[PDB]
């Protein structure tokens with residue numbers, strides 16, 4: 001199968017203003033539906049939907065990725081690794097109804113960008129152009145990562161998405177949002193105290209808390225701290241591996257650096273597999289509701 005090339009195709013006649021309107025709609029709904037997940041809100045689940053819809057990419061044959069918006073098809077929608085994401089998709093439904101012109105891939109990715117920015121995270125430049133592909137282009141289940149593994153697994157896993165050590169540690173920092181839900185993944189608890197504020201607390205907790213390797217009610221091991229935080233074996237591996245550890249310490253001591261590195265890595269993750277023509281518009285940097293006085 002010759003590796004497909006996915007060329008970004010701007011939605012007919014659309015420009016920055018159109019997308020800022022979609023961003024605003026998402027941002028306004030996030031503010032509105034603040035009760036979700038015990039008042040955590042939909043922010044965290046949207047960032048995941050974005051990561052999971054992009055994380056199926058395989059640099060080897062360009063299969064999967066954000067381009068096709070294939071999560072809308074049952075095979076991917078029902079991936080066990082995607083348990084819980086239906087909530088994010090349901091949240092986006094009204095948005096897509098109001099803006100039927102935006103592709104699914106652009107919507108899924110934009111939802112992640114919007115959530116991060118609205119939760120006070122760094123600005124993440126975003127490019128439009130993803131085009132919906134057929135159901136037969138949906139990647140098989142099993143391309144997303146396991147959480148009961150070590151640093152070697154994490155490092156190898158991320159090489160498929162063309163991510164190096166720094167990108168990996170920066171990306172994992174997204175665990176500063178939301179929490180693990182036993183019913184979804186077999187893990188339970190939040191990584192930090194600000195689960196709807198994007199900050200570098202994940203690195204600080206990892207380094208400063210007193211973790212105990214325990215078993216949860218799903219009979220799975222996870223690191224718990226007296227403060228009520230948890231870390232997956234894969235998160236803990238970042239301080240077990242020497243190379244990862246140096247970067248964890250770096251982000252724990254430099255909020256700005258973490259923001260800048262995360263922004264680059266997250267945008268890259270969301271654009272993997274996409275060929276942007278030279279004449280394509282530059283990446284859009286959307287203003288937050290707060291910056292717009294909305």
Ligand code: HEM
Pocket residue numbers: 044045047048051083084145146147154171172174175177178179180181182183184185186187232234266
């Ligand atoms: C080796 C890598 C990773 C593993 C094994 C992993 C694993 C997990 C697990 C088990 C959950 C809990 C799901 C649930 O029960 O609801 C979760 C949630 C989440 N992850 Fe990751 N993750 C990884 C990488 C990332 C990356 C790269 C991002 C995004 C840049 C990210 C963002 C999130 C967010 C925001 C949540 C919270 C979702 C919510 O509160 O509903 N994760 N992750």
Ligand SMILES: [K+]
Pocket residue numbers: 176177192193194195196197198199201
């Ligand atoms: K946080």
